[PDB]
């Protein structure tokens, strides 16, 4: 389309370019391939459950019990690390399976489909860091 | 087939059962769905390279430098563990990619297709433990 617009302007046919073609370019740029971008939203407590089952499965303690700065500390070291965090061998409640599966589906779809991941009931930086970490470790 | 054999014997038709039907059952049991079972064979040194790039990527040292008992020790703790070992983020030489990809292909195929994994140039238990660990961590 931009090739058409460029070419048309080249030959002094800009008025033709600024008709149906400009309207089309503007609609492409505004709506893209999806019309809209889906945001995802979930409670912070639902991410806390997932990390708590992870830390329980690794015999490190309960991610729920940790202070906000201990949580911050562990989350930081893990984002700095190079080792994956969990595998299929992981006790998953139905809810935890929902959270991880949502992350996998996000991972399976093109980026132009998604806007923002929104943490309901956010209160502390560890609530954001949890979500970034889950996003990385769900590929 | 066994239902046919059972039924035929029920009615005193065992002589009929012990003809073409018995030959067929025996061929099924002997050749199975693959005729043969593929063995896989690889050098021990080629597994050592893979674990050395893994330990280098995790800033733990060089798996090659470790004594046979230090190797044994690390391999044991990892098999005892519950955390996966590596992800896509891993510097892979062409050879290391071949070894991991062979393990993935093995993981993608039915068990009746495979006999044994054979370590050329085996010398010490850490050569076997390496292969068991790679088999588990390649799913």
From Swiss-Prot, chains A, B:
Tissue specificity of this protein: Expressed in all plant organs, with higher levels in roots.
On modification after translation, the UniProt record reads: Enhanced activity by phosphorylation at pH 7.3 by lowering Km and sensitivity to inhibition by L-malate and L-aspartate, while enhancing activation by glucose 6-phosphate.
The protein's induction, as recorded, is:
Upon inorganic phosphate (Pi) deprivation.
Which residues lie in coiled coils?
Answer: none
Localization: Cytoplasm
| Superkingdom in the source lineage | Eukaryota
Q: How does it assemble?
A: Homotetramer.
Q: What does this protein do?
A: Through the carboxylation of phosphoenolpyruvate (PEP) it forms oxaloacetate, a four-carbon dicarboxylic acid source for the tricarboxylic acid cycle. Contributes probably to the adaptation to inorganic phosphate (Pi) deprivation.
Family of the protein in this entry: Belongs to the PEPCase type 1 family.
Quote the protein name from its UniProt record.
Phosphoenolpyruvate carboxylase 1
Q: Which organism is it from?
A: Arabidopsis thaliana
Covered part of the full sequence, start to end and full length, is: 412 to 550 of 967
